Design a protein around this ligand. Structure first.
Ligand code: WDK
Ligand code: WDK
Lengths: 301, 301
């Protein structure tokens, strides 16, 4: 029992992290087979960063402009190309530690694990949700660009995030591994804002179920509700509307506890109108919304 | 910027996890050089577990009673010995992925990373504090025994925890890697209770500093206090007394923010007497006490 913020084991990704240097700019890259993936703004000087034209800047580059280091062993770049906002550097050596992997794009409210790296050296691991406004509330310092986010599924690493920048508000923005940004952001050093965020309702309910499974029951009640009347109370408190497929995914948890989703929605409604009266749920005084139904099942099974 | 619950990269430990089987009992072991470490209660049947005599049970064992699996490759046991509550199995192959390592015992309030494993296969990573009553609030299912807790320091893994049992309250108890239990627990299946827990004051203050560094300032005040008057308010709220060496460790954070420790203690006092009035600090509605001053510096530097 117990419920913790849990990341995937990071070793399969650690064996892929390299250091990509161009000019005086150094960030992290991802070495899979004979290709290295990194953020394209590594080809930028500090002045280029204000209003870059990346097709121009890459055209003015040669393979020998790129220093790739897999630890102390420098790697030989034999080709380079752009894939939207990620740079691809072809190297002469396939990575012998390349795991089975996919490039996948995740939806808002889905979670993943981040391997925060600096100078190609992994330094920390944590869990993250993609917020509804397409930012992540990460933990990232200078040098972290090129750090990746991933999920693991039977020894296959699904890479879903590459880190590109920190917004003025201190939240973080990046791309998928094909270089398409999440949300309406671009890779240039201008003060960009995110839309207004919202609470991931389905995740809050998954976490309420985790609480019952771990023996926290004080918030439960005999009341039930309908799907339509709950969503009326969501919008008032800045919660996403609950769909019927969201109820369906919560099916297994509802089964394992004997608490219908709409029964649990009634308890959520009460917590929103009245707060917690100084009590906690799974060690938190807030409704936590960064655990998916899948994350809960994985930890409670 | 940002502040997340952060674990150490787990790859160096993943390369050490094996599956130790005796009879019908299977748990996780730790393979370093030519020795495998696991919890000694693997030599117990379900009846032995009630009131075991481990010197008797090990004496009745031979090397061939122990099945060790490093993945699919079975390992050859050539010797066995007991080290308090951990079993040592000597194998014929040194682990080629053995990292540089130490066995260290941690103090209450110190944190570490847990690699939760099942059948010798790593499945998740999270951070933990050793509570003042010598339990950890972990996340562990059947099969997790033998999972280890560790810190990393310049590619040296300091192993500090092996998981042995879950208490009736759902908290977890284990040993150091020399097999000495943390706290007053023993490896037998009886309902054991932990002493009363307390909040790690120095960690709460480290986390308040992390908040200021990340721009959360609403809780600050112009008041200051003395070391003696603060500790009077601690005991009333079940907080550990603050020592002068605790102030000293908080030195660097106090310097980096311009907020003397005793100035920050005044803000803590106010939060305890008045609560948060519905506001949050670093995404939490509670005073978090599982980040050490070291953890904060590492993430804010
Ligand atoms: C107290 N606290 C919570 C308040 C918030 C303080 N927050 C910052 O000061 C980060 C600033 C915020 C900012 C400022 C001016 C702008 F106009 C745009 C953004 N942001 C960067 O400095 C970008 C500029 C940038 C570089 C490259 C591209 Cl493509 C786009 C942009 Cl916006 N630097 C990176 O993100 C680096 N690569 C990685 C990095 C460096 C320093 C600090 C964090 C990180 C991360 N992670
Ligand atoms: C809703 N929820 C929060 C309420 C709490 C429910 N909590 C439990 O039901 C776990 C029980 C609690 C218990 C019950 C009777 C006792 F008399 C002693 C302890 N505890 C075990 O079942 C030990 C018995 C045991 C085995 C070996 C030794 Cl040396 C000592 C003991 Cl106490 N089993 C392990 O710990 C396994 N190895 C690993 C394991 C198995 C199942 C579940 C969790 C874990 C973990 N982690």
């Amino acid at each position: 029992s117990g419920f913790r913020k849990m990341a995937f084991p990071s070793g399969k990704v650690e064996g892929c992290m390299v250091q990509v240097t161009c000019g005086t700019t150094t960030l992290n890259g991802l070495w899979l087979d004979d290709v290295v993936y990194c953020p394209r703004h590594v080809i930028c000087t500090s002045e280029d960063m204000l209003n870059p034209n990346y097709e121009d800047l890459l055209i003015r580059k040669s393979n020998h402009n790129f220093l790739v280091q897999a630890g102390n062993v420098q790697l030989r770049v034999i080709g380079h190309s752009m894939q939207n906002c990620v740079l691809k550097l072809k190297v002469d050596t396939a990575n012998p530690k390349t795991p089975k992997y996919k490039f996948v794009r995740i939806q808002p409210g889905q979670t993943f694990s981040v391997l925060a790296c600096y100078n190609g050296s992994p330094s920390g691991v944590y869990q993250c949700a993609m917020r509804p406004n397409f930012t992540i509330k990460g933990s990232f310092l200078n040098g972290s660009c090129g750090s990746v986010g991933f999920n693991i599924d039977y020894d296959c690493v699904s890479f879903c995030y590459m880190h590109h920048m920190e917004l003025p508000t201190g939240v973080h923005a990046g791309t998928d591994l094909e270089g398409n940004f999440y949300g309406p952001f671009v890779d240039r050093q201008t003060a960009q804002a995110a839309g207004t965020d919202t609470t991931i309702t389905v995740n809050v309910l998954a976490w309420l179920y985790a609480a019952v499974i771990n023996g926290d029951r004080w918030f439960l009640n005999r009341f039930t509700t309908t799907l339509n009347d709950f969503n009326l109370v969501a919008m008032k408190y800045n919660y996403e509307p609950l769909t019927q497929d969201h109820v369906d995914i919560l099916g297994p948890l509802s089964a394992q506890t004997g608490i219908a989703v709409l029964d649990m929605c009634a308890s959520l409604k009460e917590l929103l109108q009245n707060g917690m009266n100084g009590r906690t749920i799974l060690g938190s005084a807030l409704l936590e919304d960064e655990f998916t139904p899948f994350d809960v099942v994985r930890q409670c099974s």
